[PDB]
Design an enzyme around this catalytic site. Structure first.
Site, PDB file in Angstrom:
ATOM      1  N   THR A 178      36.021  35.791  45.357  1.00  0.00           N
ATOM      2  CA  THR A 178      34.907  35.327  44.484  1.00  0.00           C
ATOM      3  C   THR A 178      35.110  35.896  43.076  1.00  0.00           C
ATOM      4  OG1 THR A 178      33.423  37.142  45.039  1.00  0.00           O
ATOM      5  CG2 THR A 178      33.291  35.187  46.444  1.00  0.00           C
ATOM      6  N   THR A 179      34.461  35.305  42.068  1.00  0.00           N
ATOM      7  CA  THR A 179      34.584  35.705  40.641  1.00  0.00           C
ATOM      8  C   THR A 179      33.785  36.991  40.400  1.00  0.00           C
ATOM      9  OG1 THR A 179      34.710  33.361  40.103  1.00  0.00           O
ATOM     10  CG2 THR A 179      34.479  34.882  38.249  1.00  0.00           C
TER      11      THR A 179
END
Ligand SMILES: [Cl-]
Ligand SMILES: [Mg+2]
Ligand SMILES: [Mg+2]
Lengths: 204, 243, 222, 196, 241, 231, 195, 241, 250
Positions: free
Chosen positions: B30-31
């Site tokens: 995920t970012t």
């Protein structure tokens, strides 16, 4: 309970003209009690002679140890160890046990096979070398031997004269020590012959 | 060939393929972003809501080290936790001997040397995380990003994970448009926006935003999570910008 | 034991007596207390004789290996740091009290080391049972900017004070002179003021005086 | 042994006597008791000479390694390293240390690590006799933001009195002045300080 | 062919893992240069900051190992910092044990011996870095000693490291053929830095701004790196001649 | 293929195959359900038998008075991890006179599982755990996976055909979350949930295993005639 | 554990060992055998600290019995005595030393000679015509020095031993409850049934 | 991990052989021939040096024949470096035994222990076995004159006459043909040399390519390691040159 | 983590070859020529100083190393392997001899200890053999002058004269023709310089050639006087100037 003076006994070594002499008493005791009149304190590894006074179990143990180490030396070097080199080995081996020492007063005597130079040396129980031209003393009558040696000894004695001097030095010292005596052995060491004489002394 | 089968093996190029493979795991994550500001740093992360059954606000991904350092990472979450655990040991042993809380550059190298150590032997696997971390020390604010190779640098802004290229682009614009510097409260709102913009590269599942910050003025030089009114204010700002 | 170290213009000189004692008994009337750590770094020892020789040779050995490894002439500060860290580790159980002196690329140095691992700097030092006798002479005659010949005279005078006035010290004076840009000169028996007088009588025995039970030829050969 | 450290306007001064005794014999009458652990972090050692020299040398190593990685260490950091060694090895150590250091941020600072192995930060500190620290020692005599010349005279007088009444202390008075300007070494001979 | 995966001999007596570690050296695409003055040793390295988000003050391949020793690294920053931390530890430990500052050439030999172990022991990989150690030694004077992943080290009058190493080497070779001496006959370190930068510009054929370069300077009893403003002042001097 | 020989090897796409194979052991495992309200947390487990002569493999393990888990996959691994949780719960009580937070329990299992995925010679754990507990912040349900990923949930299921029960809990979420101060009704919701993962076989008296913890309810396991009420 | 005597005669070795075991103020046993057979032609008698004596004796017995099986050969008395001495010499610098004194009486089948070895707890080994440990030598050595002849028969040796035991029973304050006597010769080890 | 690069030196073949032992024996078969012959009044050890160079120092050289103690010698066939490790171990074991029992170690006890060390390397440790076969020539007061051989397997056997190394097949046939039990040392000397002379891969057997030793007896045992000139003489006396 | 390589990396092939030793010898063959010649009154060891770069200072890299005052070593093959072997050789001369017997080991015994270290790298877990051959020249009172070669296998042989590395085959032939048992030290140095000129291609002078002797004792190099028995080191490294003087009368 002083390990150096339980079993008792003395060693003395002297230099002469192209010869050395080393001598010991034969007494092993348990304090007051005489146990053996045949306890020789002089051993030889090739042409290098070692006398050892002090705790008898350590005398036996150090003989067995230096036989071991000089046997391996000869196999690897392909020649018999010399007195000067053996002295350093005794010093090394004793200081290895610095904080659990052998209770011994070893004396080295012999002639360098190359230079022909007479050599004697003495050590304390942790291997401090005392290298001396004249004489080395060890054991329970060391004070007595120092007195005898310092008065009797003169330089460059012939083998036959040196024999008399070292014999008289040991006998008269052992007779003024309770824990020494019960017979004596003198080694006269020339470059390529060694005579071993048993002395007649009082047996008390 | 077979140069990529074992960690710590140099390819004829002079590359460690196993480290490059660990980066793929990070790119898959995920970012997560970091923004350096006037007197501190801001951390934000994308939490994918896999199911309605996830408890909101109760799967915290951002971790504190000592009291002054924030850590966020993308990739294998357990690897990130393992790295933070080590960071806390390093920060504790530093404080124990030298009294002063560990400076951020000092702390950066402690993680750096540890991660790099996991590229020296075939008995170990490289870390499957890029770690964005920083905080406030005696010399001011510091933001760092650390990669599986053990490589790390200081950053004005940092991004990693699936939406890194989108986040980097939006970070580059902030650096250009604010040369004199960005404030702590501004950086929180910008952090929210960039995560919402970076969520376009991960838009199958909807997500939950999570922001933390260290500021000399706003948090008194300590690491705190952005909660309640300040969090909702940042979400509202981000919601307004996408539309 | 009396040992002294004296700094002069272009180097340092150490001296010592040559008496070795087991309690009140003199074991060696001419032993050497001046030990080589390196060619131009010399050591004077007091306390346990086995310990001063052992500690001097170990550091001497490690210094030679360090000199070879670094392709540099060994420094006195290296001998100092290695001796004190060794002595300290054994909490005084190695009874070595040393005066370390030498020349190196950095210059001339004079240090004392205590068995517990404390060190001191000085222009003039003394250690051993004769240290107070020696130090009285150093505190009387030492000045700044001594010559080589003045420093040897002061050093040997300091040892003589020990020989005469201290029962623990006696016999002869050994000196080692370490000058800068020169080979160190070891002056074994620099002074022999305690020569034994001719005996009143020869104690050489008539042959056959000693009674003998058995003779036998010992086999030293293979 | 009489040692003291005093913080003034421009930094901190370290003063000590030059006398080392074995029993009643003065082993060294020109002892340097002012020991450098960093460019502008010095300490005064009291207790076992072997123990304090061993500790000082280890702290010097730790501050060299600290400087390589993290840059110039604070006086607080030096005090911490001293305390750590003293506290953890208290059962086998007899060492009392006064740490004096100059930072450009914190200016002059004085820390004491006594025989306990505790750490205390003070405006000044005196240790007289056997590492014996005096809490008060003329509180009204010491003011904050003193001049260099006032502080030298204050230390010179204090150490003058100690040498007079104590046979452990004696010889010359050594001082080290820690400021932004740098490091100044002062020596005061008996004929100067005895007539005070 | 597992003789290419670990540091064991190939049939032609080669260590491929060592050779590939040398190729990792140039992965940064950075060129370094070191020269000696009378009183000083100067080391210059290209500084490339491609990302705009990077804090350029933290992007460095020059390390202050000790007070007297400087180290520039050609290779990836993780291995660079691994070598730096170890060299710092080794220099500090040396000073504690032997009571004097570790010489440049002795640190070089130590780090080279560590590198050698990685080429003989299988579990450890070589570091993909070339370490250039600089100092003004108190015995030998201005000193340059360089280490590589093979465990090889030697002293240098001057040296260059990186992709365009050969071009910088021949440029310096030609200068020393002309000047007929083993150093830059120059009083001030400022002018030795100006020489180093000038000859790098001539060799690489590229111009430099204040942010394109990174400079380290060894003098007697300290090694220090120049700031952007220290370099900028130096670049102005070159341009005005 | 070439990158699944051990846990110390990444695949070219950045996968750990030995971890993914360990995850596969859980899918083969018998279904177990976890769900919670604000007052209580419930574990429901479908126990599996070797044949009609054999006993039914116990799925639920008590860790403390306020915490326990259900397992799916390698039972011996559940025994190792549950024994580790017991010790951590116990350490917290003895040293700090403090009941171990369910969240900290999750963190400790995650960190233990992680070390077994980074070191040569070792293997990942081959079991998934549903941890329920009641601590100072109320009721909690955790899902453990031997990758090290621990997740706090209102409800979930793991094992063969778990997707059925997980879909039901996703629909029912708003209903069962508000079952406060009513144990029996929360269990009923858990039993109706696991029922969505059944094929051919139905819930019998020696087949069903239920556990519950809550506000004034120690972690207690119901088996045999005690679960007859909920069939 | 007090009295252990040994006499080496022309063709055998005789070991006499006191039968009493005393613990505190009471004599627990009056029939104790303070000897172990090391090999068919080697016997060891022992005296010293309680527990240590038997533990040491049985340990030596096991090691000699192991060597006999491994080499299918009987170690010489000199070899057994050297092994035993080395074990005691190790013991003296141990954490807790064996306080055991031993006599080793053996017949060497190669030399056709009886051999008696006396080893104290320090590992002080000595070869003797006659030996003892503790105070036993103080009352008998003067008697042995007088009558012992090296060409003595087993019967002459046993009579000389009786004289020693009689002197001990007269002048010794403790009651050793008599002695068990064992003879070691070319034919092996046998116990004198009545003494 | 490291499992990939493990040769597994201590495993059985499907036929139940030890690969590394079999390959070690193949190694030894290419080594210079060593012959031991046991007579009633002594033992002969004869060994062929591996293709000698003219500039090799012959007189101060030891390749094949080593002394273990005053009563025991060995002839080596295989890796000399491996042999020396084992020889020093044997020399120590002999002195340990002498220290313990005050008796020279019986020949078989020394042989068994040295053979047991070799065995250990074939069953555990994951190391390559010792690439060495020994001929032990020794005397003790129990069995008198004894010849043994050990090989990398750790198996040892007793012999009246034996060969190890190259052309053992050929050498063993010739020894089996001419050997008898009432043989003298002087006769055994002639047999050993004649056997090497026929089995050698060299054009003609010369003093410079040989190592020779005898363990003979007015009640003591003497080990004679032959000098170059003494080999030259015994080679003419038997009429081979 | 940890060294998991506790198994031999050198093993017997079906042909009985020890691959890694054979390959180590191949690395030595690629190595720069070095040689040794034994005279009646000394020994000479010599090698080319193959300079990696002309900017490099070839003085700093010492291919000829003092091991003890009376023993020197040169090599052919991998320089780094030689450097760590010299360090280990110097240390083992002290730890396993000088600290026991108070004197430096004889040539054959130090060679024996170096050989042992190299044999261990042949059999120990997780290591490759040393990729060097050593020539060790030395003097000791009871054996006199001696020259030994040591190979990666750990095998050592005494030589009257030999060469190792690039042009060893040709160099050994040259030495066979020139060597006799009546050579004086100056004659052996002369022959060494003739032999080495064949194998050197580029510049041949005192700056590209490294040469040391084991000869007479050097009191001037001892660094102190006063002990008559201590007469100084027999090992002496010839200077750049001393070599050039003997290249004129060549
Ligand atoms: Cl090293
Ligand atoms: Mg008497
Ligand atoms: Mg490797």
């Amino acid at each position: 309970s002083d390990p150096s003076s339980i079993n008792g006994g003395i060693v003395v070594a002297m230099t002469g003209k192209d010869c050395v002499a080393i001598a010991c008493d034969l007494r092993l005791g348990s304090q007051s009690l005489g146990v053996s009149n045949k306890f020789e304190k002089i051993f030889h590894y090739g042409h290098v002679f070692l006398g050892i006074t002090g705790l008898a179990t350590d005398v036996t143990t150090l003989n067995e140890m230096f036989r071991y180490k000089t046997n391996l030396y000869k196999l690897k070097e392909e020649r018999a160890i010399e007195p000067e080199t053996f002295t350093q080995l005794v010093s090394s081996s004793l200081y290895e046990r610095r904080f659990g020492p052998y209770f011994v007063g070893p004396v080295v005597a012999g002639i360098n096979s190359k230079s022909g130079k007479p050599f004697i040396a003495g050590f304390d129980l942790i291997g401090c070398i005392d290298e001396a031209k004249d004489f080395i003393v060890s054991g329970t009558a060391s004070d007595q031997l120092f007195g005898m040696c310092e008065s009797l000894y003169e330089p460059n004695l012939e083998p036959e004269d040196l024999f008399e001097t070292i014999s008289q030095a040991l006998l008269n010292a052992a007779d003024r020590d309770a824990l020494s005596g019960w017979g004596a052995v003198v080694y006269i060491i020339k470059k390529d012959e060694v005579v071993k004489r048993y002395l007649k002394m009082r047996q008390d | 060939t077979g140069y990529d089968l074992s960690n710590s093996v140099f390819s004829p190029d002079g590359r460690n393929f196993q480290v490059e493979y660990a980066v793929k795991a990070v790119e898959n994550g995920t970012t997560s972003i970091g923004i350096k500001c006037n007197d501190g740093v801001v951390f934000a992360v994308e939490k994918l809501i896999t199911s309605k059954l996830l408890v909101p606000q109760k799967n915290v991904k951002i971790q504190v080290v000592d009291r002054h350092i924030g850590c966020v990472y993308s990739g294998l979450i357990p690897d990130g936790r393992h790295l933070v655990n080590r960071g806390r040991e390093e920060a504790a042993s530093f404080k124990k001997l030298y009294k002063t809380p560990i400076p951020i550059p000092a702390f950066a190298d402690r993680l750096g040397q540890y991660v790099q150590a996991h590229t020296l032997y075939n008995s170990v696997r490289p870390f499957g995380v890029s770690t964005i971390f920083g905080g406030v020390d005696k010399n001011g604010a510091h933001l760092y990003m650390l990669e599986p190779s053990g490589s790390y640098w200081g950053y004005k802004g940092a991004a990693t994970g699936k939406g890194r290229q989108s986040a980097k682009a939006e970070l580059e614009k902030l650096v250009d448009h604010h040369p004199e510097g960005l404030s702590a409260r501004e950086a929180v709102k910008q952090a929210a926006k960039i995560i919402y913009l970076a969520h376009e590269d991960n838009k199958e599942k909807d997500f939950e935003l999570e922001i933390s910050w260290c500021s000399l003025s706003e948090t008194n030089g300590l690491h705190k999570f952005v909660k309640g009114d300040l969090l909702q204010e940042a979400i509202d700002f981000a919601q307004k910008e996408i539309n | 034991t009396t040992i002294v170290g004296v700094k002069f213009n272009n180097g340092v000189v150490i001296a010592a007596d040559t008496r070795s004692t087991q309690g009140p008994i003199v074991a060696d009337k001419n032993c050497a207390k001046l030990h080589r750590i390196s060619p131009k770094i010399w050591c004077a020892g007091a306390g346990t004789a086995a310990d001063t020789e052992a500690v001097t040779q170990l550091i001497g050995s490690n210094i030679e290996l360090h000199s070879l490894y670094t392709s540099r002439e060994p420094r006195v500060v290296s001998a100092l740091q290695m001796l004190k860290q060794h002595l300290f580790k054994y909490q005084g159980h190695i009874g070595a009290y040393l005066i370390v002196a030498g020349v190196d690329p950095t210059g001339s140095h004079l240090f004392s080391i205590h068995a517990h691992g404390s060190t001191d700097v000085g222009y003039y030092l003394s250690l051993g049972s004769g240290s107070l006798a020696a130090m009285a002479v150093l505190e009387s005659h030492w000045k700044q900017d001594l010559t080589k010949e003045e420093a040897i005279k002061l050093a040997s005078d300091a040892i003589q004070a020990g020989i005469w006035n201290d029962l623990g010290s006696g016999s002869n004076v050994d000196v080692c002179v370490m000058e800068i840009g020169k080979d160190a000169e070891y002056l074994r028996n620099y002074l022999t003021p305690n020569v034994r007088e001719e005996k009143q009588k020869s104690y050489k025995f008539p042959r056959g005086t000693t009674a003998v039970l058995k003779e036998s030829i010992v086999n030293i050969c293979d | 042994t009489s040692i003291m450290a005093v913080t003034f306007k421009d930094g901190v001064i370290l003063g000590a006597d030059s006398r080392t005794t074995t029993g009643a014999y003065i082993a060294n009458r020109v002892t340097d008791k002012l020991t450098r652990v960093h460019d502008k972090i010095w300490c005064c050692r009291s207790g076992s000479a072997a123990d304090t020299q061993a500790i000082a040398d280890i702290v010097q190593y730790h501050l060299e390694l600290y400087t390589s990685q993290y840059g110039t260490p604070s006086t607080e950091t030096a005090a911490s390293v001293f305390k750590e060694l003293c506290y953890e090895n208290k059962d086998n150590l007899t060492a009392g240390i006064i740490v004096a250091g100059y930072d450009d941020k914190n200016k002059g600072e004085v820390y004491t690590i006594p025989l306990g192995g505790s750490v205390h930060k003070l405006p000044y500190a005196i240790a007289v006799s056997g590492s014996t620290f005096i809490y008060g020692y003329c509180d009204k005599n010491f003011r904050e933001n003193m001049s260099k010349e006032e502080t030298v005279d204050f230390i010179k007088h204090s150490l003058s009195q100690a040498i007079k009444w104590d046979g452990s202390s004696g010889g010359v008075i050594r001082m080290v002045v820690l400021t932004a300007a740098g490091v100044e070494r002062l020596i005061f001979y008996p004929d100067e300080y005895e007539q005070l | 062919g597992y003789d290419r995966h670990i540091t064991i001999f190939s049939p032609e007596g080669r260590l491929y893992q060592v050779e590939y570690a040398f190729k990792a050296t140039n992965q940064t695409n950075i060129n370094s240069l070191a020269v000696r003055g009378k009183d000083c040793t100067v080391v210059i390295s290209q500084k490339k900051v491609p990302d705009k988000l990077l804090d350029p003050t933290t992007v460095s391949y020059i390390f202050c190992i000790s007070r007297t020793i400087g180290m520039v690294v050609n290779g990836p920053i993780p291995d660079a910092r691994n070598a730096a931390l170890r060299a710092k530890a080794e220099a500090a430990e040396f000073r504690y044990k032997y009571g004097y500052d570790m010489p440049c050439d002795v640190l070089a030999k130590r780090m080279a011996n560590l590198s050698q172990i990685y080429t003989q022991r299988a579990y450890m990989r070589p570091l993909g870095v070339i370490l250039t150690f600089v100092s003004v030694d108190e015995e030998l004077g201005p000193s340059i000693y360089k280490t590589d992943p093979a465990g090889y080290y030697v002293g240098y009058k001057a040296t260059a490291t990186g992709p365009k190493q050969q071009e910088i080497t021949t440029n310096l070779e030609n200068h020393f053929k002309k000047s007929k001496i083993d150093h830059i006959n120059e009083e001030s370190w400022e002018k030795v830095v100006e020489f180093a930068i000038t000859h790098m510009i001539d060799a690489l054929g590229t111009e430099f701004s204040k942010n394109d370069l990174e400079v380290g300077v060894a003098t007697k009893d300290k090694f220090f790196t120049l700031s952007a403003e220290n370099i900028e002042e130096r670049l102005v001097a070159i341009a005005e001649q | 293929n070439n990158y699944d020989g051990d846990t110390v090897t990444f695949s070219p796409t950045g996968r750990l195959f030995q971890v993914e194979y360990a995850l596969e052991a859980i899918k083969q495992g018998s279904v177990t359900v976890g769900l919670r309200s604000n007052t209580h947390a419930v574990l429901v487990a479908l126990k599996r038998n070797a044949d009609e002569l054999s006993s039914y493999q116990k799925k639920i393990i008590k860790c403390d008075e306020h915490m326990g888990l259900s397992l799916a996959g390698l039972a011996p691994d559940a025994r190792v991890l549950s024994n580790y949780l017991r010790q951590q719960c116990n350490y917290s009580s003895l040293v700090f006179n403090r009941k171990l937070a369910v969240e900290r329990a999750g963190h400790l299992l995650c960190d233990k599982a992680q070390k077994n995925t980074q070191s040569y010679g070792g293997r990942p754990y081959g079991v998934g755990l549903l941890i329920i507990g009641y601590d100072k912040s109320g009721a909690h349900l955790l899902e453990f996976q031997p990758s090290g990923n621990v997740t706090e949930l209102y409800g979930t299921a793991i094992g063969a055909r778990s997707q059925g029960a997980k879909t039901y809990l996703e629909r029912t979420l708003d209903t069962f979350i508000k079952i406060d101060g009513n144990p029996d009704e929360l269990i009923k919701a858990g039993v109706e949930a696991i029922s969505q993962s059944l094929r051919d076989e139905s819930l019998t008296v020696d087949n069903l295993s239920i556990a519950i913890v809550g506000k004034d309810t120690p972690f207690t396991i119901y088996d045999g005639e005690a679960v007859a009420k909920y069939i | 554990m007090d009295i252990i005597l040994g006499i080496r005669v022309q063709d055998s070795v005789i070991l006499a060992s006191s039968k009493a075991v005393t613990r505190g103020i009471s004599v627990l046993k009056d029939s104790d055998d303070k000897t172990r057979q090391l090999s068919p032609h080697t016997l060891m008698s022992f005296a010293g600290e309680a527990g240590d004596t038997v533990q040491f004796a049985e340990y030596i017995q096991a090691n000699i019995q192991l060597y006999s099986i491994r080499e299918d050969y009987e170690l010489s008395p000199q070899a057994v005595s050297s092994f035993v001495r080395q074990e005691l010499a190790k013991s003296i610098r141990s954490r807790r030393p064996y306080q055991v004194n031993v006599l080793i009486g053996g017949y060497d089948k190669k030399k056709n000679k009886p051999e008696l070895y006396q080893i104290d707890y320090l590992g002080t080994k000595v070869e003797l015509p006659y030996g003892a440990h503790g105070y036993s030598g103080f009352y008998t050595f003067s008697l042995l020095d007088h009558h012992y002849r090296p060409d003595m028969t087993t019967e002459e040796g046993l009579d000389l031993l009786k004289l020693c035991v009689q002197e001990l029973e007269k002048r010794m304050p403790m009651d050793f409850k008599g002695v068990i006597v064992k003879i070691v010769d070319k034919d092996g080890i046998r116990q004198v049934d009545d003494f | 991990g490291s499992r990939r690069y493990d040769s597994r030196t201590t495993i059985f073949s499907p036929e139940g052989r030890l690969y590394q032992v079999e390959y070690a024996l193949e190694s030894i078969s290419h080594a210079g021939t060593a012959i031991g012959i046991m007579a009633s009044d002594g033992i002969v050890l004869a060994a062929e040096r591996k293709v000698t160079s003219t500039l090799l120092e012959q007189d101060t050289s030891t390749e094949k024949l080593y002394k273990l103690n005053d009563k025991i010698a060995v002839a080596v066939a295989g890796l000399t470096a491996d042999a020396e490790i084992l020889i020093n171990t044997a020399r120590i074991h002999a002195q340990n035994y002498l220290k313990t029992y005050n008796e020279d170690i019986p020949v078989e006890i020394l042989v068994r222990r040295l053979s047991d060390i070799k065995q250990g390397y074939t069953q555990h440790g994951g190391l390559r076995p010792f690439g060495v076969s020994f001929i032990y020539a020794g005397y003790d007061d129990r069995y008198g004159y004894q010849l043994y051989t050990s090989n990398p397997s750790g198996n040892y056997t007793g012999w009246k006459a034996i060969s190890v190394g190259a052309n053992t097949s050929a050498a063993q046939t010739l020894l089996q043909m001419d050997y008898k039990d009432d043989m003298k040392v002087d006769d055994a000397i002639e047999l050993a040399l004649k056997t090497l002379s026929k089995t050698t891969d060299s054009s003609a057997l010369t003093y410079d390519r040989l190592e020779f030793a005898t363990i003979r007896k007015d009640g003591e045992v003497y080990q004679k390691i032959f000098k170059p000139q003494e080999i030259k003489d015994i080679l003419v006396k038997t009429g081979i040159t | 983590m940890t060294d998991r390589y506790s198994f031999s990396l050198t093993t017997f092939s079906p042909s009985g070859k020890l691959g890694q030793i054979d390959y180590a010898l191949t690395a030595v063959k690629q190595g720069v020529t070095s040689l040794g010649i034994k005279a009646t009154n000394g020994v000479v060891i010599a090698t080319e100083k193959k300079s990696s770069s002309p900017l490099a200072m070839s003085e700093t890299l010492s291919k000829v190393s003092l091991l003890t005052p009376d023993i020197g070593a040169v090599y052919s093959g991998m320089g780094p392997d030689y450097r760590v072997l010299v360090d280990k050789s110097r240390k083992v001369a002290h730890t396993s001899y000088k600290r026991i017997y108070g004197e430096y080991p004889p040539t054959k015994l130090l060679v024996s200890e170096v050989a042992k270290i190299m044999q261990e790298a042949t059999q120990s877990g997780g290591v490759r053999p040393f990729g060097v051959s050593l020539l060790i020249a030395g003097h000791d009172e009871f054996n006199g002058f001696s020259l030994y070669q040591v190979d990666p296998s750990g095998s050592y042989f005494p030589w009257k004269a030999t060469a190792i590395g690039k042009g060893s085959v040709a160099a050994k032939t040259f030495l066979e023709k020139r060597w006799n048992d009546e050579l004086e030290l100056e004659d052996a140095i002369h022959i060494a310089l003739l032999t080495l000129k064949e194998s050197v291609e580029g510049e041949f002078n005192g700056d590209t050639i490294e040469l040391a002797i084991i000869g007479d004792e050097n009191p001037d190099l001892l660094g102190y006087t006063g002990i008559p028995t201590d007469k100084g080191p027999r090992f002496r490294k010839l200077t750049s100037q001393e070599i050039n003087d003997r290249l004129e009368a060549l």
